[PDB]
C-alpha cells in the first residue's frame, strides 16, 4: 500500500511559520529560513533566561552602590556589614527598599557601619 506525503509535510511547515510570525523578510515567509531562525532564537532564549538573573543583580547592585554612597560608603563596604550583621535580605529587595523605603535602607546602612 502506497502512502505519499499527503497532508503531513505542509502542516509541519505551518508549525514552523506560526512560531516565525513577526520575523523579517522570508524568515517569517520562507519555511527553511524560518527553521534556521527558530534555531538561533531557541538558543538565544535559554542563553538569555540564564542571563536575566545576571542582568538584574548587576542592575540592583548598581542602584544599591548609589544609595550606599548617599550615606558615605560603597556597595562593597556594606555587603560585609550585612554579612557580619547576619542580615540575609537580598539585592532584589534591598534594591527596592533603597528607592521606595529610603529610611529602612538607611537603617540597614547604619546597622552595617556598626557591625564592622
Amino acid at each position: 500500500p502506497r502512502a505519499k506525503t499527503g497532508v503531513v509535510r505542509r502542516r509541519k511547515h505551518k508549525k514552523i511559520l506560526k512560531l516565525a510570525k513577526g520575523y523579517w523578510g522570508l524568515r517569517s515567509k520562507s519555511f527553511r529560513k524560518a527553521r534556521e531562525t527558530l534555531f538561533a532564537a531557541g538558543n538565544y532564549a535559554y542563553a538569555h533566561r540564564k542571563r536575566r538573573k545576571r542582568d538584574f543583580r548587576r542592575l540592583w547592585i548598581v542602584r544599591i552602590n548609589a544609595a550606599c554612597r548617599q550615606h558615605g560608603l560603597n556597595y562593597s563596604t556594606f555587603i560585609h556589614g550585612l554579612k557580619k550583621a547576619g542580615i540575609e535580605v537580598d539585592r532584589k529587595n534591598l534594591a527596592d527598599l533603597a528607592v521606595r523605603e529610603p529610611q529602612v535602607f538607611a537603617e540597614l546602612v547604619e546597622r552595617a557601619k556598626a557591625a564592622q
Partner: protein, 101 residues
C-alpha cells in the same frame, strides 16, 4: 506596614491584600500558612538578623497550577543535534492576610 518574607528560596515584599505567585507549596488550597520574616517596616522599622523571632506572615492558599509554557530549545550546528522541550513551572498563588510580628 510591610514585610519581606522568604519562601521558595526567594524573598518577597508582601502587604495585606496581595496575590503572590510563589514556588509550589505542600499546602491544601483554602488552607493558611505562615511565612518566615526578614524585615518589617513602614510604621515601626524592625530588621531581622537573619529573621525575627515571633513575627510571621499569614497567607491563604488560593490554589495551585502551572505557569505558561516556556520553549526550551537546544541546537548544535553541523552535528544534527536539536532538542525540544515543553516546560510549565509549578507555582502557588497566595493571599496576604496579616502581618503578625
Amino acid at each position: 506596614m510591610f514585610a519581606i518574607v522568604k519562601t521558595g528560596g526567594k524573598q518577597y515584599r508582601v502587604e495585606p491584600g496581595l496575590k503572590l505567585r510563589v514556588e509550589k507549596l505542600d499546602a491544601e488550597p483554602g488552607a493558611t500558612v505562615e511565612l518566615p520574616v526578614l524585615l518589617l517596616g513602614g510604621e515601626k522599622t524592625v530588621v531581622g538578623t537573619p529573621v525575627v523571632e515571633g513575627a510571621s506572615v499569614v497567607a491563604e492558599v488560593l490554589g495551585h497550577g502551572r505557569g505558561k509554557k516556556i520553549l526550551v530549545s537546544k541546537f548544535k550546528a553541523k552535528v544534527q543535534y536539536r532538542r525540544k522541550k515543553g516546560h510549565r513551572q509549578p507555582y502557588t498563588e497566595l493571599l496576604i492576610k496579616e502581618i503578625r510580628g
